[PDB]
Amino acid sequence: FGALLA
Amino acid sequence: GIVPVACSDGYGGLVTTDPKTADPVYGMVYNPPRTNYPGRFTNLLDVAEACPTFLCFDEGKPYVVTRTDEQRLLAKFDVSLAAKHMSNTYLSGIAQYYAQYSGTINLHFMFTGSTDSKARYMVAYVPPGVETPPDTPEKAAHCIHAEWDTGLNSKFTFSIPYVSAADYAYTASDVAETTNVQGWVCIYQITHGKAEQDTLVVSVSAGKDFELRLPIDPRSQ
Amino acid sequence: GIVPVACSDGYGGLVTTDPKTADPVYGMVYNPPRTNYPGRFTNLLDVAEACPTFLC
Amino acid sequence: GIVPVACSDGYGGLVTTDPKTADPVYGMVYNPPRTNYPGRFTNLLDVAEACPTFLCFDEGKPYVVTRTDEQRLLAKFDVSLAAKHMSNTYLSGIAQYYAQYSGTINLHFMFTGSTDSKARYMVAYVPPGVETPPDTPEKAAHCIHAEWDTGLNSKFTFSIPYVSAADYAYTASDVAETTNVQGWVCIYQITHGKAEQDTLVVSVSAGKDFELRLPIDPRSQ
Amino acid sequence: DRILTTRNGHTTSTTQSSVGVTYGYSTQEDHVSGPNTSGLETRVVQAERFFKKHLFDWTPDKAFGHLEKLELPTDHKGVYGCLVDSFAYMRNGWDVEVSAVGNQFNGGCLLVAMVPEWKEFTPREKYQLTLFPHQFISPRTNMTAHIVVPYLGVNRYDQYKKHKPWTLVVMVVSPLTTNTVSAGQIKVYANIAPTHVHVAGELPSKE
Amino acid sequence: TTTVENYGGETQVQRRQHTDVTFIMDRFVKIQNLNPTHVIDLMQTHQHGLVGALLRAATYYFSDLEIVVRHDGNLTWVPNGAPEAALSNTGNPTAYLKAPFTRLALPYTAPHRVLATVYNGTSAQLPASFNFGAIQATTIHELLVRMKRAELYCPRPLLAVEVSSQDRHKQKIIAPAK
Amino acid sequence: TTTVENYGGETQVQRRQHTDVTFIMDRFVKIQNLNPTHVIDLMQTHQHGLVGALLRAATYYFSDLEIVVRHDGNLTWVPNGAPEAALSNTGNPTAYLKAPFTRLALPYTAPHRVLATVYNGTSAQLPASFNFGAIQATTIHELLVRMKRAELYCPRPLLAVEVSSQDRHKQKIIAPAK
């Protein structure tokens, strides 16, 4: 859910 | 023969700002590459426009508050880069090295209250020409002003317009000046609901068309 | 070597009407526009020819 | 009239390194041809890279030896062009006239023992950051190192890598420097077989990327 | 929507109270390989992961200007820490996340910033800390600040035992306010992770 | 960024030439603490001077230099990292006395890619390698430094004089006589 | 030639401009032992001076010259092989006193294809023909020589100061004050 900063 | 010349009187002296370049004495020096070094700035105003700094209020506070919930003037300050309220800003730090300016100056307001606190503020630009600043929103309403709520967006921005007779204005303020030359900015609290201990943080940055000209070295050295 | 020159006697002095221009020291100054400012005169005689004045 | 000029203050003085050339006074001198004169060098580093010179050990010896056949540190020296062990090298002789350097430095090892003597050595680069140099091969093994045998090829070469924070390093060493800034080089004898009186001659030359910059005249004159 | 999940190595942080990620000065890293390392540098990904540290307890008594700092890197008892003792030179960026958990009824504001070459700031200079990569934390808006900065400094590689380029700074902009419904105090924690970790001069064993 | 258009105004054209970093730093400034043997360190400029303060308003910088020196005897310059003893020999760039003073162009010679105005650690004080070399002469009366091709990185606080008047800092501005 | 590639390293790019023979020798150096009548001999440079030592680090050399002379009265130069008595006549290149000193360009005038810094035999001392001529004036206060278009052949030893400290030769390196 939402944004990812992998 | 050789070339005849006339050594002209009044020329040749060293001028701390002349465009001449000296003669090199140590050549062929290659310096480590600086390509892609982070954080470079090429113009002071690029920084001044992107990084608002805090205004200075009552007791060195970058914010204003209020206990009563009636209409009241929260703060009033001179529209001068030499104003006390601006003394700790980056904009004023930069401006002190220039004799003149012109353009927009941006004020940023940030509400730090809890979710259960709401407030309605008003900011107005009072041009020069009046003896004393308006003490109430009613009187100030006739001036260029903006009013706003504190909801999901706790931040608000207002532009102080450049409005003077001349195309430029001085950055410094002369001792002769009784009433500020560029007018005042007034921040009122129309009213609030349970926001007695909550504050409004104010900061300032340069506007898109803000401009400084004529560099000077004024500080006492 | 370098360029040989002869500093000539009698030249170089300041003359209140010489055509020389001094060296600039403060650059890049842009001045407010003056285009279309009313009442400009470029020659004294233009004025003298269009505005008679009273004899005494 | 004639050309007006401004004799500028601060210019014109003689500078021992200026690029100006004087005015000739005796012309048309033809000199005997020098085409094809043997042994010309155009760059000091070409020579420094092709002619290793001897390091200076214990008693002005360009070599190290050992009586015991156990693991032992044969020699340890500062990775500095001002190191005592380098004091008699051509590289240091050249380096003294430059403020900074960077690049590879090559160490050459030559075994002078008889055919009946065999030995196994190890050389390691100990970067700055440790209080004292490793006294045993075991400890030094974790550093950049090389180990080798003495057989038909009695010569071995090892490159001391340039590893520092800055892109350049000083050639001189300041009195403030307690522990060497560029680390140490350690030469160990892993073990040997009947090589008690046999020696290992060590020399140094410049690496392919060794570089010196910023000439100086430091010697007391 | 407003829910951010950051992942560094085998560690993740899912923040629901996020404003976004602020990248300081640049989004790219100056070539990790330069002439000062003679191509002997390597990357140690096993060290690029989160580690925690408590900064301070934000209370109503702390007024404007109260400043807390954490110079990076700090003592690390993990893989990263091992690197610091095994190599002479290192370089790395920082993925920083700071959280001040209270409740929507607390008021007040905190300034979270990453400062290059820390120096003790004077009361007056504090009004300009926004000149540095920062983000604000205000209970009504967010409980988590998130900043990402690259490596920098006069030298391409550093010796962290002698110099610490980046310094995390948290300052009270507006004091914490409390209701009968709010929290009494807010504990500020930091979730930090080194980035693009490179080592260079391998040292000997201390035994 | 907000503009006056929000309430019917019109944003004008701006000429930021004078706030250009390279331009503003490009001028001569004094260095007050002098000695017969002096190491050129830009941090020796006055902290409130036009250039001194702007320089300190940045973390990292780079620039070549141009200097003016009024001295007695001959002037000798030595690059960054050179032994102090070298200043005594003519092999190094030496300028022979020519009134009223000597003006030279010096290149950046530090071993670092850039220098800093503040350094958090040990080499308080800044590392010794943060210099543009040293100059020496029998006597050095005055020294003017000029930053050529300046580059500034990572801005830091810059302060105006603090105000006590509680409203505006007033001071005598130039005006005609009579 | 070995490189750091042997153990995983990477050889970098090098700029050898400063170790170029022509460039390095191209600068003014002093000559200390002076007389009203002086024969220009490059071996009169200091043995440890930047140029003096580098010159001695070569067996054979060639170069034109440029000199600076601070003198009283007029300066007269005479070519290699000229009778000493000739220095008294104006027919030879003579420079009339002009403060603060005289700077001239002189050509190599030796009868040999090249000169030497060491000579094993008789013409210890070097042959008398190893000179760039002679100069004369009422009084010669200072003399600076400069090797133009220098060429060096057959390198010889070049030594650094010897070390006693048994580890490193340490000396005061320039650094900021305060």
Q: What is the DSSP code string of D70-117?
A: S-EEEEEEESSTTBGGGTTSHHHHHHTTEEEEES-EEEEEEE---TT-
Phi, psi dihedral angles at E4 (to 5 degrees): -110, 135
Q: What residues does B2 pair with on adjacent strands?
A: none
> Distance between CA B91 and CA F57 in Å, rounded?
12
- Interface C:B, ≥3 CB–CB pairs < 8 Å: yes
Counting one residue from C and one from D, how many pairs have CB atoms under 8 Å apart?
Answer: 16
User: Alpha-carbon distance F50 to G169, whole Å?
Assistant: 43
* Distance in angstroms (rounded) separating the CA atoms of residues E83 and E75: 12
B abuts G (3+ Cβ pairs < 8 Å): yes
Are D82 and G170 within 8 A, CB to CB? yes
Neighbours of B197 (CB within 10 A): 18
Put simply, the answer to whether G113 touches D86 (Cβ < 8 Å) is: no
In this structure, the strands spanning F94-95 and F75-78 are: antiparallel
CB E199 within 8 A of CB E82: no
Cα-based angle E63, E67, E72 (whole degrees, multiple of 5): 160
Farthest CA pair distance, chain C = 72
Chain B nearest-CA distance from F177, in A, is 15
**The two structure tokens encoding residue D118:** 């065999």
Cα-to-chain-centroid distance, residue B16: 29
Token code pair at residue F168: 């505006």
R_g (Cα) of chain G, nearest Å: 21
Per the structure, the complete domain to which residue G56 belongs is given by 1-178
Query: What residues of chain D have any CB closer than 8 angstroms to a CB in chain C?
Result: 1-2, 4-6, 20-24
Experimental method used, please?
X-ray
- Which one of E121, E124, E162 has the shortest CB-CB distance to F121? E162
Type of residue numbered E189: Y
Of E98, E38, E100, the C-alpha closest to D182 is E38
Spatial distance between the Cα atoms of G13 and B30, rounded to a whole number of angstroms: 12
Cβ within 8 Å, pair E130-B89: no
Find, in chain E, the residue whose alpha carbon is nearest to that of D134. E204
DSSP helix/strand/coil, F42:
helix
Length, in residues, of chain F: 178
Mutate to test the interface with E, among A1, A4, A5 (most CBs of E within 10 A): A5
Look at G27 and F128 and tell me if their CB atoms are within 8 Å.
no
Q: Does D58 touch chain G (CB under 8 A)?
A: no
Rg (CA), chain F: 21
Spell out the alpha helix ranges (H) of B28-77: 44-50
Q: Do D173 and G168 touch (CB under 8 A)?
A: yes
- The CA distance from B188 to G34, in Å, is 87
Amino acid identity of E90?
Answer: M
CATH number of the domain at G138, please.
2.60.120.20
- Across chain C, how many H-helices and E-strands are there? 1, 1
Q: How far apart are CA D21 and CA D24, in angstroms?
A: 9
User: What tokens appear for F136 in the block?
Assistant: 């020496």
Tally of CA atoms within 13 A in the half-sphere of D86 that contains its CB: 28
- Give F60's contacts in chain E (Cβ within 8 Å): 116, 152, 154
Chain B's closest residue to G19, CA to CA, is B28
- Asked if E187 and E61 count as a contact pair (C-beta separation under 8 A), the reply is no
> What residue type is assigned to position G13 of the chain?
V
Distance from CA of C18 to the nearest CA of B (A): 11
What backbone phi and psi angles, to 5 degrees, belong to C36?
A: 70, 30
Which residue(s) pair with E116 in the sheet?
E166
> How far off is chain D from G122, nearest CA to CA, in Å?
22
Give the position of tokens 């005169």.
Answer: C41
Q: Which residues make Cβ contacts (< 8 Å) with residue C56, sequence separation at least 6?
A: none
Angle at E80 between CA E79 and CA E86, to 5 degrees: 90
CB atoms near residue G85 (< 10 Å): 8
Side-chain-facing half-sphere of F111: CA atoms under 13 Å: 24
Every domain of chain E and the residues it spans: 1-207
Pairs of residues, one from chain E and one from chain F, whose beta carbons lie less than 8 Å apart: 57
CA-based nearest residue in chain E for residue F130: E154
CB distance B58 to D46 below 8 Å: no
Rounded CA gap, B22 and F102, in Å? Answer: 10
The separation between the first and the last C-alpha atoms of chain A, rounded to the nearest angstrom, is 14
What phi, psi does G11 have (nearest 5°)? Answer: -70, 135
CB contact under 8 A, A5 and E2: no
Phi, psi of F4 (to 5 degrees): -70, -5
**Angstrom distance (rounded) from CA G42 to CA G145:** 8
**Contact state of F23 with C28 under an 8 Å Cβ cutoff:** yes
Coil/strand/helix, residue D208: coil
Q: What is the dihedral of CA F82, F85, F90, F95, to 10 degrees?
A: 70
C-beta atoms of G8 and E39 within 8 A: yes
Count of residues making up chain D: 221
Rounded Cα gap, residues B57 and B201, in angstroms: 10
Q: Are E16 and E2 in contact (CB under 8 A)?
A: yes
The CA distance from E164 to the nearest CA of chain B, in Å, is 17
Taking CB atoms and an 8 Å cutoff, what residues of chain F touch E127?
Answer: 157
- Give whole-number Cα distances, E168 to B70, C12, E180, E189, in Å: 41, 64, 32, 12
C8-to-B4, B6, D214 alpha-carbon distances in Å: 6, 6, 43
Tell me how long chain C is. Answer: 56
Q: If interface means Cβ-Cβ distance under 8 Å, which residues of chain F face chain D? A: 68, 78-83, 85-86, 88-98, 100-104, 109, 111-113, 128-129
Q: b/e per residue, C20-55, with b = 16+ CB within 10 A?
A: eeeeeeeeeeeeeeeeeeeeeeeeeeeeeeeeeeee
The distance from CA D57 to its chain's CA centroid, rounded to whole angstroms, is: 15
Measured between beta carbons, which residues in chain E are less than 8 angstroms from residue B154? 138, 140-141
Residues of E in contact with G10 (CB under 8 A): 33, 38-40
Chain B partners within 8 Å of D167 (Cβ): 32
The answer to whether D159 touches D104, Cβ cutoff 8 Å, is yes
| B47 contacts F21 by C-beta, under 8 angstroms | no
Interatomic CA distance for residues G106 and G163, integer angstroms: 40
D164–G contact, CB cutoff 8 A? no
Write the single-letter amino acid at F21.
Answer: V
- Strand ranges in E83-143 using DSSP code E only, listed in sequence order: 90-101, 107-116, 134-137
β-partners of residue E12 are E7
Closest CA to D41 of G66, G16, G13, G15: G16
**Fold classified for E1-207:** Jelly Rolls (2.60.120)
Rounded Cα–Cα distance for residues D219 and F91 (Å): 10
Determine contact, residues F76/G15, Cβ cutoff 8 Å.
Answer: no
Resolution (A): 2.9
Nearest to E182 among B39, B61, B114 (CB): B114
Q: Which residues contact G24 (CB under 8 A, 6 or more apart)?
A: D44, D97, D215, G18, G50, G51, G54
Handedness of CA G27, G33, G36, G40 (dihedral sign): negative
Set out the domains of chain D in order of their start, with CATH numbers: 1-221 (2.60.120.20)
Q: How far apart are CA G128 and CA G40, in angstroms?
A: 11
Domains in chain G, number: 1
Which amino acid would we find at residue B137? P
* Residue B4: partners with Cβ closer than 8 Å, 6 or more residues away: C5, C6, C8, D2, D3
Q: Which chains touch D (3 or more CB pairs under 8 A)?
A: B, C, E, F, G
CA distance C41 to C39: 7
Backbone angles phi, psi at D27, to 5 degrees: -100, 170
How many whole angstroms from its chain centre is CA D190? 25
Closest CA to D104 of B3, G6, G64: G6
Longest dimension (CA), chain F: 71
Contact G175 F128 (CB under 8 A): yes
Q: Do F170 and B82 touch (CB under 8 A)?
A: yes
Walk across the sheet containing B118-126 and list its strands: B72-78, B184-193, B118-126, B144-149
